[PDB]
Amino acid sequence: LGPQVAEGENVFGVCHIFASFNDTFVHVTDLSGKETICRVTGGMKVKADRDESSPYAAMLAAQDVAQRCKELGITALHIKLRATGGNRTKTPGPGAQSALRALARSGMKIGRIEDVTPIPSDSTRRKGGRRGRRL
RNA sequence: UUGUUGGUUUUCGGAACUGAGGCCAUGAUUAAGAGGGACGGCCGGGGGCAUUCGUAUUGCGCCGCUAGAGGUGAAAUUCUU
Numbered sequence: 316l317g318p319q320v321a322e323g324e325n326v327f328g329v330c331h332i333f334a335s336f337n338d339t340f341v342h343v344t345d346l347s348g349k350e351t352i353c354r355v356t357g358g359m360k361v362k363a364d365r366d367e368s369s370p371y372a373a374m375l376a377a378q379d380v381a382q383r384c385k386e387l388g389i390t391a392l393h394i395k396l397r398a399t400g401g402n403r404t405k406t407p408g409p410g411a412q413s414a415l416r417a418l419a420r421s422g423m424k425i426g427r428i429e430d431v432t433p434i435p436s437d438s439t440r441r442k443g444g445r446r447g448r449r450l
Numbered sequence: 451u452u453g454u455u456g457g458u459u460u461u462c463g464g465a466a467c468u469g470a471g472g473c474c475a476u477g478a479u480u481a482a483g484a485g486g487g488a489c490g491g492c493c494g495g496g497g498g499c500a501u502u503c504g505u506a507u508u509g510c511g512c513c514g515c516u517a518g519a520g521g522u523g524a525a526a527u528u529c530u531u
């Protein structure tokens with residue numbers, strides 16, 4: 316079902332991983348990124364909203380992305396990790412490691428890894444007020 | 451400053467204006483680790499006007515795949531074939 320490639324050569328995809336503190340997205344596209352092979356999220360694997368960002372949920376999602384990518388015919392992935400970005404946090408959420416760990420452990424070749432968190436050159440006011448989120 | 455009068459022969463001192471002189475060693479303290487100002491080469495997210503760029507947030511159009519997404523201590527209001 317995949318492309319006709321020599322067995323000494325492999326076909327590359329791009330896995331956009333969006334690891335927030337509320338959910339994890341494992342999204343594999345082609346090199347252009349316009350076409351999609353398989354987007355599974357951490358909320359598609361758990362029943363509780365609290366666990367949508369869990370490392371376990373991120374691992375299970377990465378595993379479904381790995382199987383679909385292989386059956387479609389992807390063999391290697393370029394990783395593009397991102398946090399929420401913008402005015403929000405820049406550290407990737409707890410599911411970032413498990414998703415990338417699960418991809419490598421699922422027999423998925425890894426190409427180039429790069430952080431793509433959108434960083435503002437300063438921007439819109441952040442939510443919370445000047446006194447912040449007084450939790 | 452002439453005692454027979456008066457005219458005094460008058461002189462007299464002072465007070466103004468004015469010209470030419472000489473003479474004074476002729477006449478201006480210093481340059482504030484006070485200040486002002488000049489100049490010189492710099493220096494600075496100092497101020498005003500115009501201009502340029504940056505990515506992000508939000509919205510929209512097209513395309514892809516898909517059933518969730520979001521949010522939280524947990525949720526729900528909310529968005530969604």
Ligand SMILES: [Mg+2]
Nearest residue numbers: 337338364367
């Ligand atoms: Mg969540």
Ligand SMILES: [Mg+2]
Nearest residue numbers: 338358364367
């Ligand atoms: Mg959620």
Ligand SMILES: [Mg+2]
Nearest residue numbers: 447448449450
């Ligand atoms: Mg406190």
